[PDB]
Amino acid sequence: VNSFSGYLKLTDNVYIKNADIVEEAKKVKPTVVVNAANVYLKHGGGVAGALNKATNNAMQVESDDYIATNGPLKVGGSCVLSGHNLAKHCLHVVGPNVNKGEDIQLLKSAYENFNQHEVLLAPLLSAGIFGADPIHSLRVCVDTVRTNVYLAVFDKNLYDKLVSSFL
């Protein structure tokens, strides 16, 4: 049992809710919140911009130190950093960005990072400003993630379409 509430069960292990991931995280304080990161951990927009703003830029300051020490991530890769006031940890995951010409096939590799964590609160990877079709992202999520993932979708109209088109 956990405190996630109001989710619709899609499969054994995948759950979905029309919710603001920042508000979900502040309420639940999950062990892991997933960020829609880029390889430079530049948290300017989309989910990353929202999560970083909720940390009053502490996520960005921490990320700058990570990059100075370790260099950029890979597309499809991830790192674990602090969750600050949102979660114990933030799993920064880099989905391909179609607006950068990146190969959508890397989306499966991106979702595989979720399997290293028993429970996650997450957005749909590569959706939003990353340019992929969220219906496809949900399909890859369900077909890749085996651990328990609680998906938060901000946009009500896209949430409704994601549920109503799910096979």
From Swiss-Prot:
Which intervals hold domain Macro?
1-167
Q: Where in the cell is it found?
A: Host endoplasmic reticulum membrane
Which reaction equation describes what this protein catalyses?
Thiol-dependent hydrolysis of ester, thioester, amide, peptide and isopeptide bonds formed by the C-terminal Gly of ubiquitin (a 76-residue protein attached to proteins as an intracellular targeting signal)
Activity regulation information from UniProt: Inhibited in vitro by GRL-0617.
Impact when changing residue 31 to A? In strain: Mu/B.1.621
UniProt membrane topology term: Multi-pass membrane protein
What this chain does, per the entry, is described as: Responsible for the cleavages located at the N-terminus of the replicase polyprotein. Participates together with nsp4 in the assembly of virally-induced cytoplasmic double-membrane vesicles necessary for viral replication. Antagonizes innate immune induction of type I interferon by blocking the phosphorylation, dimerization and subsequent nuclear translocation of host IRF3. Also prevents host NF-kappa-B signaling. In addition, PL-PRO possesses a deubiquitinating/deISGylating activity and processes both 'Lys-48'- and 'Lys-63'-linked polyubiquitin chains from cellular substrates.
The subunit structure is: May form homohexamers. Interacts with N protein.
Return the protein name: Papain-like protease nsp3
Q: State the organism named in the record.
A: Severe acute respiratory syndrome coronavirus 2
Positions spanned in the full protein: 1025 to 1191 of 7096
